Design a binder for this molecule. Structure first.
Ligand SMILES: O=C(/C=C/c1ccc2c(c1)O[C@@H](c1ccc(O)c(O)c1)[C@@H](C(=O)O)O2)O[C@H](Cc1ccc(O)c(O)c1)C(=O)O
Ligand SMILES: [Zn+2]
Length: 257
């Protein structure tokens, strides 16, 4: 029964998930002046041309756009990564107000939302085995600011009416995640965790410096989703972000400057 309310939100999660107070939790604040440029990271490779989206699901915390991950079709490699990581799903975290919503922060700045493209290390065979390993996942995080519309997001926005409440899904084929990427792939990277329960410490985070722009109308549609199931009292799906966690014994590396 974890969630984002007062009685079940992030400050409570540790009771069911003690790793919430662990040594490599996410998100974190990215102190841009303290991140160090690492000239050895290798180039980062996002290869989404054969991506096969299948479905979109309201899971009661966010919505997931799910991909066919039964072959190497949409993969992330390079950068800090050893080997190849397959795209399984993406989702967002967002606020009730444009002044909050991101999980990572940049010099304490909160963005309106944050996109997570979730990938698992193919050496572990599937996602459920991967999440039990310290290098099991690579999550590409992309900040959203409110300004111009993102054309490549609109297909997602337009289907949300059909998945308003928890447990609803809809077919969502032929969606191209390349339409969600900024121009630059400059990034910060650090070892962390899932940002929702079970909070497993299995993620190499790759957080892009350049945000994408989405329109006020687009984010407003996100905020019409519901945490609740159909036929239950309406609770808008907003503020589904975990705040920054202590950095502890970690260094954030930059791919640039
Ligand atoms: O570890 C797991 C499963 C953990 C898990 C389950 C559901 C999840 C999950 C992890 O990640 C969460 C998640 C995903 C993305 C995020 O950004 C995030 O913050 C949180 C969550 C969600 O989608 O919100 O779903 O299963 C294996 C078994 C097991 C099960 C299945 C298999 O195929 C296998 O080989 C082994 C085991 O229990 O050892
Ligand atoms: Zn996430």
């Amino acid at each position: 029964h974890w969630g984002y309310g007062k009685h079940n939100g992030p400050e409570h999660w540790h009771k069911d998930f003690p790793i919430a107070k662990g040594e490599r939790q996410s998100p974190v604040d990215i102190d841009t002046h303290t991140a160090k440029y690492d000239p050895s990271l290798k180039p980062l490779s996002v290869s989404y041309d054969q991506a096969t989206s299948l479905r979109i699901l309201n899971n009661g915390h966010a919505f997931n756009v799910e991909f066919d991950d039964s072959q190497d079709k949409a993969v992330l490699k390079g950068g800090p990564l050893d080997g190849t990581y397959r795209l399984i799903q993406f989702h967002f975290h967002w606020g009730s107000l444009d002044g909050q919503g991101s999980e990572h922060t940049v010099d304490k700045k909160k963005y309106a939302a944050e996109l997570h493209l979730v990938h698992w290390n193919t050496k572990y065979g599937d996602f459920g085995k991967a999440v039990q390993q310290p290098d099991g996942l690579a999550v590409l995080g992309i900040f959203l600011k409110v300004g111009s519309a993102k054309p490549g997001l609109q297909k997602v926005v337009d289907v949300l009416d059909s998945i308003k409440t928890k447990g609803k899904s809809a077919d969502f084929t032929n969606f191209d995640p390349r339409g969600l990427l900024p121009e630059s792939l400059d990034y910060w990277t650090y070892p962390g965790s899932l940002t929702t329960p079970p909070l497993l410490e299995c993620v190499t985070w790759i957080v892009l410096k350049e945000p994408i722009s989405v329109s006020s109308e687009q984010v407003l549609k996100f905020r019409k989703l519901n945490f609740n199931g159909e036929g239950e009292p309406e609770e808008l799906m907003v503020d589904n972000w975990r705040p920054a966690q202590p950095l502890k014994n970690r260094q954030i590396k930059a791919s640039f400057k």
